[PDB]
Design a protein around this ligand. Structure first.
Ligand SMILES: Cc1cc2nc3c(=O)[nH]c(=O)nc-3n(C[C@H](O)[C@H](O)[C@H](O)COP(=O)(O)OP(=O)(O)OC[C@H]3O[C@@H](n4cnc5c(N)ncnc54)[C@H](O)[C@@H]3O)c2cc1C
Ligand SMILES: Cc1cc2nc3c(=O)[nH]c(=O)nc-3n(C[C@H](O)[C@H](O)[C@H](O)COP(=O)(O)OP(=O)(O)OC[C@H]3O[C@@H](n4cnc5c(N)ncnc54)[C@H](O)[C@@H]3O)c2cc1C
Ligand SMILES: COC(=O)Nc1ccc2[nH]cc(CCNC(C)=O)c2c1
Ligand SMILES: COC(=O)Nc1ccc2[nH]cc(CCNC(C)=O)c2c1
Ligand SMILES: [Zn+2]
Ligand SMILES: [Zn+2]
Lengths: 227, 228
């Protein structure tokens, strides 16, 4: 029995991202996996890191330090309930899939705010106590990204450089740092300009890949792999 | 004379980020430059890219595509007014400085939302009309970043790898793509670990660099610069 969390960041259910999320839900449910979706836009998830993230009185209401106040609120079980709800989902999950369109070589802001606010000190890592002494060791993570640009543009001598260059902040800087073993990204290049059949083939390849997700070897999450 | 926009993303005025922002304002103001600060947290700036960003009839209300709808709305002048307020500041600026703590090897989400919502198609780039043909050509941009990690950790063979590695999505993916000439980042490493003397020297080194900022050349914003 496995638990899967899909963190999903798209405004439109009929979008190509919506269909990739629905095909993941379907296929992992088919396999008997325990599945949970965090549909950030439908939840109107708060992306801003503010003092509202700590309930009751602040540790030092004079100089506000976000990392510090959230660390202490975590330990003392005082974080806002939107955050702690996400952390419970993350704690129980064996695999976390993030499904999102690429926005500026990165995640949409709503998802960036999820990472900023949910993966707090004390939950995802301590200082020190990161990368391999990172508190989410044993969990798998997988980025499933859709792009505007074609796969050619994302070659190391393309205009955009190699896909693996933009992955560094997300795979290594965030997911590895927290202790995740990181599975190879799923990149669905440029669905808006692919045919309705190349689009089926991308959705089907995702479905097909999810069939054997649990047999997969994690990538070596190193400078060399990305660069 | 010159116009400068500082896009600032820190919750706390007494922070190291707040100090670096204040010296920027003071030093550029002293020079006789025109200065504007977008203080994202004080504005409670909206980071989410939603259908609230368009006020007109949607081009395709059956299936909502944020990129298509905001491009249309930009041309029609039906974008939300918080977006067009920022675009006006960018349009008039000669130099845009981003002042922020590094969050997950990137900008805090509120600043990510500013990039997602403000730099829309039609305004910052077109297809075609990106990288060296981006619509914001002629403008300068500069990232001024503070870290929890030390300079030691941000090296080719440190835990974090070289600091340039994390700059790629912002410098090249965003700023260069929109046509900015990118100046060399100002990275202020580990102010929390640093002593009172090293912190003060970090504020003064920024103050000092700003005196000669208009004489600097842009970086070559290429894979080679970032990665070797
Ligand atoms: C702020 C912003 C920043 C961006 N930054 C970048 C960037 O840095 N780099 C980059 O490359 N791109 C960028 N993009 C553009 C790009 O659109 C996104 O990266 C995104 O990946 C598009 O995916 P989508 O799900 O919205 O496609 P959609 O438009 O929703 O889907 C494409 C087509 O597939 C159809 N479809 C839906 N379901 C199915 C199905 N199951 N079978 C067949 N067809 C289906 C849809 O109806 C649609 O016609 C950016 C866009 C925005 C708005
Ligand atoms: C969600 C999150 C994600 C993060 N991700 C990363 C990451 O990926 N990589 C990384 O390296 N770090 C990361 N950090 C940590 C780090 O704190 C930030 O990156 C940030 O750079 C710290 O800057 P600050 O302005 O808040 O420092 P402050 O805490 O405000 O400054 C430290 C000290 O400087 C003092 N100071 C202020 N002004 C002056 C002055 N004028 N002269 C002398 N001293 C002064 C302050 O009073 C304080 O004592 C993350 C933090 C959070 C909360
Ligand atoms: C205040 O809260 C955080 O510092 N949080 C946080 C989150 C992700 C991070 N990645 C790299 C760092 C550097 C941390 N400092 C040292 C000394 O390594 C880091 C810190
Ligand atoms: C309107 O919404 C966006 O498409 N916005 C946007 C923003 C930043 C981007 N960087 C690279 C691309 C893809 C461009 N190539 C294509 C379209 O083939 C892109 C698109
Ligand atoms: Zn790694
Ligand atoms: Zn570049």
């Amino acid at each position: 029995g496995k638990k899967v969390l899909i963190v999903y960041a798209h405004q439109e259910p009929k979008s190509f991202n919506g269909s990739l999320k629905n095909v993941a839900v379907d296929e992992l449910s088919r396999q008997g996996c325990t599945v949970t979706v965090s549909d950030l836009y439908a939840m109107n998830f708060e992306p801003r890191a503010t003092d509202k993230d700590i309930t009751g009185t602040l540790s030092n209401p004079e100089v506000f330090n976000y990392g510090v106040e959230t660390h202490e609120a975590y330990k003392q079980r005082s974080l806002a309930s939107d955050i702690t709800d996400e952390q419970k989902k993350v704690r129980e999950a064996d695999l976390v899939i993030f499904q999102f369109p690429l926005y500026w070589f990165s995640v949409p802001a709503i998802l960036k705010g999820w990472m900023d606010r949910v993966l707090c000190q004390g939950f995802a890592f301590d200082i020190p106590g990161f990368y391999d002494s990172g508190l989410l060791q044993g969990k798998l993570a997988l980025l499933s990204v859709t792009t505007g640009g074609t796969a050619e543009m994302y070659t190391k001598t393309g205009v955009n450089g190699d896909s693996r260059y933009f992955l560094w902040p997300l795979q290594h800087g965030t997911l590895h740092f927290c202790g995740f073993k990181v599975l190879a990204p799923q990149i669905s290049f440029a669905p808006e300009i692919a045919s309705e059949e190349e689009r089926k083939g991308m959705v089907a390849a995702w479905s097909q890949r999810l069939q054997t997700i649990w047999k997969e070897e994690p990538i070596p999450c190193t400078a060399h792999w990305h660069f």
